[PDB]
Amino acid sequence: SSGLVPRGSHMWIGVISLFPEMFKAITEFGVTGRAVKHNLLKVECWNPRDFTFDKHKTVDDRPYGGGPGMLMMVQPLRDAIHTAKAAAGEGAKVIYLSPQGRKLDQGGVTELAQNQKLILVCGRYEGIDERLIQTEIDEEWSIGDYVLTGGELPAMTLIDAVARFIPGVLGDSFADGLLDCPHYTRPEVLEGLTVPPVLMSGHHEEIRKWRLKQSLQRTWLRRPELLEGLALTDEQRKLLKEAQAEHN
Amino acid sequence: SSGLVPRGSHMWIGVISLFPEMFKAITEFGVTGRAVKHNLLKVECWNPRDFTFDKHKTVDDRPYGGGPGMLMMVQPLRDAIHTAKAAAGEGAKVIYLSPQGRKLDQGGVTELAQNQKLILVCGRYEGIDERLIQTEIDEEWSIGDYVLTGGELPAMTLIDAVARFIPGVLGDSFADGLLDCPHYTRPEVLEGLTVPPVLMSGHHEEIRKWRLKQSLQRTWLRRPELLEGLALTDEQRKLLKEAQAEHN
């Protein structure tokens, strides 16, 4: 690898997936695509299909005890995982994306971002054999309490979220553990709705305090449990009380 | 549209995105790709870039009051939204994916799945002008408490999650509001780990009760707040108590 872009904190992400082409959505486009071109982020995919030996390249298998659904076939998946681990060498944490995993939040994203090397295992069908968790997986993580057709979209969501914390990928993420304040661009009037005059004022301290107050107000109204997680500053306590008094 | 596959509950999803090619990850592959080919799911994209008039096809704009980041330019985004709404005709709910949105969970996925027509607006940069929420957006939803480079991955996560509830897309999603039980496929022994003998027993009622007990045990150990959301059946109360007594 060569180039001029500072990449001390670069991340390597190994991916195990039956649909590696899905990952073009992050490696070919936008901020993540730029990260890849600039060697800040590398996404390398192994497909269990390439580790099959039967004529029809079988990658699913029947669950012991029956059921409607299939599981990922153990041998092709295990061989793909082992190949990824050999490529990564020492220090790679292996993650399985599952609804039974630890719930991802921004704090967890920043913990994951400390790893220089990750391997992300993408389950299809009803998922993977329990014993592969014990033998191959370091951590299970969920992107949220819902079921998807595969772990690819969860894996891409985690890649994108961690990529933002790689220095140089971006040009403020839930600033203060709070929801975003309202923001505005041109025009000054839209369908009779005006930009709050403080944002046109050029008064940097007044704008900062208005934005903080609005963030505290929105977080209180939409997600009050997020405020319970915080030890508010004196300034935040006062702006929230002002917002709550104005609301009432 | 023509074909033989039953599609009474088919869904149309309009998408507003600066990177419509990202959506190939769902429309070209796997279960979602099959849904699209069989006319169960249609994903139609409008790109704000196509609604620009300046020589350089500008789609970002500066925030009033300053800041580090840009917002989506209003005119191209609004025109794209209006074109999607005209294509959808009556009854289309407009969704903006944002961290300040309602938190998606499987119950919310099933509520969203009742809509025959959705429009999903994908924010890039720091997001979109507050007044477009009031004028264009019916509902805001978040896929989870983390920030991504754009609303594309959130949008694709919601499409995939709702697609599973379209009759015919699949061949059991958090069965019972509980985490998955352990499951197993070949071989019978893996790195000295055996398949629980009950799953080889062929006793359908014994297997059902073991799986339910294991689901209740895993949910209790990993996500005990999920049990507080439930009114357990008599059988579930007894299997949980058995699992908790065995654990202690």
Ligand SMILES: NCc1cccc(CNc2ccc(C(N)=O)cn2)c1
């Ligand atoms: N039986 C459901 C199941 C169990 C493991 C893996 C998958 C694949 N699909 C996924 C994976 C993760 C997530 C998530 N919420 O992170 C959602 N869907 C499915």
Ligand SMILES: NCc1cccc(CNc2ccc(C(N)=O)cn2)c1
């Ligand atoms: N300033 C952060 C911001 C606000 C709105 C929209 C985006 C775009 N990226 C997103 C959108 C949704 C989600 C989510 N959690 O659903 C995450 N990232 C960003």
